[PDB]
């Protein structure tokens, strides 16, 4: 993510600032930081702001500028061509960008949000069914980091401290059994009810960095205010309310909606079980731990050796230590390349098939096939241009193109209307 922080200025920037002290007449220039600190901690010439803003943010700003192509654009300092094209493909997958590279209506809003386009899309779908105080709480946690301390890091594995650690890891996940972001949401939310006097004890019981939450607590105020500004026309009139930051427990329907907001944000970083996409290709069983169970992203390229595609879930993740068979589609904040034997994955939550298509209907990843002819599978044709029927959707890469490695979603009922000779997805029915 991109964040704005206080940081040491460049040496030359500092020298110019000395100059205007003496521009009027010869000046004493004072620096709170020491000279020896100045040589070490100040860069000679400040880094270009083009290098500082995210490349995907540069693209989205240009798409607000409707620039025909990132490359046709003239600029002083280059990001790489392929990275800029990747950002375009990235934004398209979110639904921010059309197939014709024009900025969508939602694309325009993600441009307006100061936050990163992936996190900006969250600020859009956050305000659904009174789940807004959460998606800020998740988003604040995601950017700040993971407050939890691993048992391996602590050195508790002394044994009794592991039991309390395990009980602490359990009480994280009472909210959501199979999701790792939501157990964290239960925690970042949990301390809020906990009194300030007892926060440090709650911090010690759960091995939580006391400092890293105060920035989360401060950050959620800032993020909620930005969303309240952007959503409401009177964007300056809206003010941050502590009661607004305060949140009530979700319903199971809200959880499923929350799982959808998680999927909109990292729709690219979603992986199916490798065994699910190729049953019996790689030997898997319940005895194999969830470290052993492989996964493969839809967006990932197909590889000559299946194991190269395969990615594996983290041990600290609850889904690993439940001891139950994981769900088919998993979705991860980031892929951790550490571990040659197995590539580590942290998964926010578990996303279902048809709901995954619902982040797919919004985005451009989904590919819909033709209507089928079978028993009870007739297509209603109300007008010459519109129809209702069941269509098999394939998420990301199609069957025809084998360069990537995609998975096919089960067929779902849908309303289709012809535009430009191809029938757009009005809504699943």
């Amino acid at each position: 993510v991109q964040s704005f922080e206080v940081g040491w200025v460049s040496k030359a920037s500092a020298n110019q600032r000395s100059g205007r002290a003496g521009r009027t007449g010869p000046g004493h220039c004072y620096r709170l930081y020491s000279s020896a600190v100045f040589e070490h901690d100040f860069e000679q010439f400040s880094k270009p702001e083009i290098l500082r803003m995210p490349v995907e943010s540069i693209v989205l700003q240009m798409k607000s500028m409707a620039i025909h192509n990132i490359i046709n654009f003239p600029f002083p300092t280059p990001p790489d061509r392929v990275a800029l094209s990747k950002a375009i493909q990235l934004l398209q997958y979110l639904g921010a960008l059309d197939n014709k590279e024009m900025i969508t209506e939602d694309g325009k809003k993600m441009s307006l949000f100061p936050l990163s386009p992936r996190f900006s899309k969250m600020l859009l779908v956050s305000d659904e069914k009174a789940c807004l105080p959460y998606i800020v709480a998740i988003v604040s946690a995601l950017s700040v980091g993971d407050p939890f301390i691993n048992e391996f890091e602590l050195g508790i594995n002394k044994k009794e401290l592991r039991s309390k650690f395990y009980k602490s890891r359990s009480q994280f996940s009472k909210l959501d059994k199979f999701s790792d972001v939501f157990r964290l949401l239960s925690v970042v939310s949990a301390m809020d009810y906990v009194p300030k006097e007892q926060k440090e004890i709650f911090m010690k019981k759960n091995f939580l960095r006391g400092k890293l939450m105060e920035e989360i607590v401060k950050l959620r105020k800032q993020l909620m205010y930005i969303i309240k500004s952007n959503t409401s026309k009177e964007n300056i009139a809206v003010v941050i309310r502590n009661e607004d930051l305060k949140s009530d427990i979700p319903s199971v329907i809200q959880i499923k909606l929350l799982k959808q907001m998680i999927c909109a944000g990292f729709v690219d970083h979603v992986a199916v079980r490798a065994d699910v996409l190729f049953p019996d290709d790689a030997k898997i069983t319940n005895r194999t731990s969830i470290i052993n169970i492989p996964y493969i992203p839809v967006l990932a390229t197909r590889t000559p050796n299946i194991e190269d595609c395969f990615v594996y879930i983290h041990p600290t993740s609850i889904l690993n230590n439940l001891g139950e068979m994981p769900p088919k589609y998993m979705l991860y904040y980031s892929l951790h390349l550490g571990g040659n034997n197995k590539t580590r994955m942290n998964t926010l939550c578990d996303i279902a098939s048809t709901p995954l298509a619902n982040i797919a209907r919004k985005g451009l990843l989904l590919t819909y096939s033709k209507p089928l002819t079978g028993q009870g599978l007739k297509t209603v044709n109300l007008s010459p241009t519109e129809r209702y029927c069941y269509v098999v959707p394939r998420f990301g890469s199609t069957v025809d193109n084998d360069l990537k490695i995609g998975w096919d979603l089960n067929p779902i009922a849908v309303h289709q209307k012809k535009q430009k000779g191809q029938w757009t997805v009005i809504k699943f029915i």
């Binding site: 009480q171 909210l175 239960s186 925690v187 939310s189 949990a190 009810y193 906990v194 427990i249």
Partner: peptide, 4 residues
């Protein structure tokens, strides 16, 4: 509290 409920989250606990």
């Amino acid at each position: 509290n409920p989250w606990l």
